[PDB]
Ligand binder design. Sequence first.
Ligand SMILES: CC(C)C[C@H](NC(=O)[C@@H]1C[C@H](N)CN1C(=O)CC[C@@H](NS(=O)(=O)c1ccc(NC(=O)c2ccc(C(N)=O)cc2)cc1)C(=O)O)C(=O)N(C)[C@@H](CCC(=O)O)C(=O)NCCCCC(N)=O
Ligand SMILES: O=P([O-])(O)O
Ligand SMILES: [Ca+2]
Ligand SMILES: [Ca+2]
Ligand SMILES: [Ca+2]
Ligand SMILES: [Zn+2]
Ligand SMILES: [Zn+2]
Length: 168
Amino acid sequence: MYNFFPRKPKWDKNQITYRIIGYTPDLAPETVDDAFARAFQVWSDVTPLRFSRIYDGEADIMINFGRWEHGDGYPFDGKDGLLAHAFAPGTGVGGDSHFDDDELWTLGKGVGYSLFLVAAHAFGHAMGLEHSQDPGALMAPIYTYTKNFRLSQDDIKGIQELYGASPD
Ligand SMILES: CC(C)C[C@H](NC(=O)[C@@H]1C[C@H](N)CN1C(=O)CC[C@@H](NS(=O)(=O)c1ccc(NC(=O)c2ccc(C(N)=O)cc2)cc1)C(=O)O)C(=O)N(C)[C@@H](CCC(=O)O)C(=O)NCCCCC(N)=O
Ligand SMILES: O=P([O-])(O)O
Ligand SMILES: [Ca+2]
Ligand SMILES: [Ca+2]
Ligand SMILES: [Ca+2]
Ligand SMILES: [Zn+2]
Ligand SMILES: [Zn+2]
């Protein structure tokens, strides 16, 4: 079933804040923003968690792209291997999600990697979800493309364990 980080860390608030510092050239900026939004919404759908975008100063979830050493001491590794990473909820680095720009970022294709799926996956980590044993779960330790995506019961009960279900 579902898993969390060792000390079960979580946001002390439902109103979360995100900022996109950098883009990938692989996708249109507008299409990146829609991918990051839609990724936030798979989790917002089933919790009282609300993600609101800001365009300057420290946010909860600082989003960027980078390659190799990108100034956090967790280097990326070129094409494939690490696609991305997120930090468990916390101040500063806590919940910050980074994507390796040595990857080919795509949407709606089996070729390269869906920014939306990896982001959804990564944002799981940023809410305090670890990997899960269900091979169909979004918090699977493996990337898998599907054209038509739905949050598994495993991922819903895990996030609702921390933050409760949809009140709306
Ligand atoms: C940069 C990392 C080292 C940070 C780490 N986070 C992780 O270790 C996470 C959790 C887990 N251990 C995997 N993680 C990774 O960062 C690995 C990267 C990535 N690995 S991946 O590239 O091989 C990978 C694997 C799987 C996917 N999956 C998908 O994209 C995907 C899955 C499923 C589906 C589908 N079809 O359903 C579609 C797509 C994508 C990428 C991933 O899993 O995101 C972490 O949170 N810490 C070390 C924390 C430790 C926290 C703790 O232990 O309590 C830390 O010390 N942070 C310092 C400060 C933060 C807290 C504070 N403010 O005080
Ligand atoms: O490259 P991974 O994320 O499938 O291990
Ligand atoms: Ca890589
Ligand atoms: Ca942060
Ligand atoms: Ca790229
Ligand atoms: Zn990083
Ligand atoms: Zn992961």
